[PDB]
Design a protein around this ligand. Structure first.
Ligand SMILES: CC(C(=O)SCCNC(=O)CCNC(=O)[C@H](O)C(C)(C)COP(=O)(O)OP(=O)(O)OC[C@H]1O[C@@H](n2cnc3c(N)ncnc32)[C@H](O)[C@@H]1OP(=O)(O)O)=[N+]([O-])[O-]
Ligand SMILES: CC(C(=O)SCCNC(=O)CCNC(=O)[C@H](O)C(C)(C)COP(=O)(O)OP(=O)(O)OC[C@H]1O[C@@H](n2cnc3c(N)ncnc32)[C@H](O)[C@@H]1OP(=O)(O)O)=[N+]([O-])[O-]
Ligand SMILES: [Cl-]
Ligand SMILES: [Cl-]
Ligand SMILES: [Co+2]
Ligand SMILES: [Co+2]
Ligand SMILES: [N+]
Ligand SMILES: [N+]
Lengths: 144, 144
């Protein structure tokens, strides 16, 4: 089951400037930063709240590491803004299989590595009324 | 202080079809529906989780009631997808004043009526790295 909003994926040209904007404006601090070479991003997670399923909700700020990447292509076409939304689950493999069986395109056969060791997959935005939709299971199993 | 992600504002051409998509695909049910004539939307709130500040996190699906509206103009230009993100606070008036004092454009002098009697304001997307950003205080005061 999808039990939380895990994060909002926000594309930006300059991660350090955008991180500072969120700190200065709202007082949101950096929970974690990393580079995901497979996905072609440098990201920062800003934790906003904890959630009733034992997880948390973050802003995920993403700058591209290369133009030939999902985020690099999208920023070139659309400029900075919301790129995707992510829902959390205790079993991304099972939820992804159930959604595949409804005819929504699941982009990965098998979940891939995401932020902080998470396992992630995506649903095609053209099957989700224009919203690129991520499904994520956190690496650290959570206590509701 | 902004203590939660309150909702993701998602624009759609047909609220009833998009509501059914989220029910059929993810099992998300309608928490509330209403029309906000001032804003020019028909909306559905789908509750995803509760939050650690005593609030909740929703998907807010929005269809325009008129073409000459924020959402009607945006859908005409961009098609269906994420339109805004909303952060919750126990004091939208005070948080809005503090953010006004940083030179970010606050669109309302005084918060306006939003979903389920909430009080809302917006920050200009061009001052927030391309993200239309809502600040909301729920009508029902919340217990962390
Ligand atoms: C590390 C991590 C992350 O979140 S990494 C985030 C970056 N990674 C991802 O986004 C991977 C999944 N996304 C993708 O593989 C691709 O972006 C998509 C789904 C395949 C689309 O790639 P395409 O190369 O096909 O892009 P393309 O520009 O060709 O566009 C194909 C169609 O998809 C639409 N589209 C593309 N990106 C979109 C987006 N982010 N939201 C909505 N619509 C989108 C686009 O406008 C076009 O619609 P149109 O036909 O009406 O013009 N984490 O831990 O959470
Ligand atoms: C009931 C409720 C709701 O949430 S009601 C949701 C609908 N209401 C709202 O969105 C009200 C606040 N928004 C607005 O007043 C307006 O949409 C905005 C901020 C003023 C923009 O209105 P404008 O008429 O100026 O739109 P316009 O197309 O002229 O565009 C002005 C600039 O803003 C950009 N823009 C407009 N809407 C945008 C959006 N949703 N996200 C990001 N950028 C946006 C747009 O692309 C353009 O950038 P560019 O210069 O790079 O081209 N609730 O309870 O939570
Ligand atoms: Cl890596
Ligand atoms: Cl009304
Ligand atoms: Co993500
Ligand atoms: Co809203
Ligand atoms: N740029
Ligand atoms: N349409």
């Amino acid at each position: 089951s999808l039990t939380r909003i895990d994060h909002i994926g926000i594309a930006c040209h300059d991660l350090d400037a955008t991180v500072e904007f969120y700190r200065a404006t709202y007082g949101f601090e950096v929970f974690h930063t990393e580079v995901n070479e497979e996905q072609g991003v440098r990201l920062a997670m800003l934790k906003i709240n904890d959630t009733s399923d034992g997880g948390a909700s973050y802003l995920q700020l993403l700058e591209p590491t290369r133009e030939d990447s999902a985020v690099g292509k999208w920023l070139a076409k659309n400029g900075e803004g919301v790129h995707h939304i992510a829902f959390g689950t205790a079993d991304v493999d099972a939820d992804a299989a159930d959604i595949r069986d409804k005819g929504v395109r699941v982009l990965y056969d098998e979940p891939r590595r995401g932020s902080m060791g998470s396992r992630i997959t995506f649903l095609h935005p053209k099957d989700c009324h224009g919203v690129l939709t991520e499904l994520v299971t956190s690496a650290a199993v959570e206590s509701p």
